[PDB]
Write a protein that binds this ligand. Structure first.
Ligand SMILES: *C(=O)c1cc(C[C@H](NC(C)=O)C(=O)N[C@H]2CCCCN(Cc3ccc(-c4ccccc4)cc3)C2=O)ccc1OP(=O)(O)O
Length: 106
């Protein structure tokens, strides 16, 4: 159950995800998964990042879920569950601004 996941914030807004992620104490990769405001059946993986050009900032990636069961950000790299996807991206940055590190604090 995704709702059982501590990183699953469910129905929170994009502005709220940014308010929570834009905390100076959050290292790069602080993240949360929420429902997308625009795409029904898709979620957003909101991630914090930091660099000297943009300072602390947030990126939002769309996570799709197929009826065929896979979950993915890029269709070329799919997972049997949202949990597996989070685990994979916690170990590989790939196209993300940073690999997922810890759950965002409220
Ligand atoms: C959630 O569904 C959500 C997310 C988005 C996508 C956002 N849009 C906005 C308005 O911020 C977006 O454009 N994000 C960027 C993130 C940075 C990288 C550029 N990009 C395309 C891209 C390229 C490569 C990969 C990738 C990742 C891992 C491995 C391989 C490749 C991912 C993404 C983006 O997509 C829009 C809306 C939205 O719902 P809301 O509730 O409105 O926020």
């Amino acid at each position: 159950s995704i709702q059982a996941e501590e990183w699953y914030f469910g129905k929170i807004t994009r502005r709220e995800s940014e308010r929570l992620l834009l905390n100076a104490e959050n290292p790069r990769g602080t993240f949360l998964v929420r429902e997308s405001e625009t795409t029904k059946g898709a979620y957003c993986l909101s991630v914090s990042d930091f660099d000297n050009a943009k300072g602390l900032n947030v990126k939002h990636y769309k996570i799709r879920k197929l009826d065929s069961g896979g979950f993915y950000i890029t269709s070329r790299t799919q997972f049997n569950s949202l949990q597996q996807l989070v685990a994979y991206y916690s170990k590989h940055a790939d196209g993300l601004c940073h690999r997922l590190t810890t759950v965002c604090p409220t």
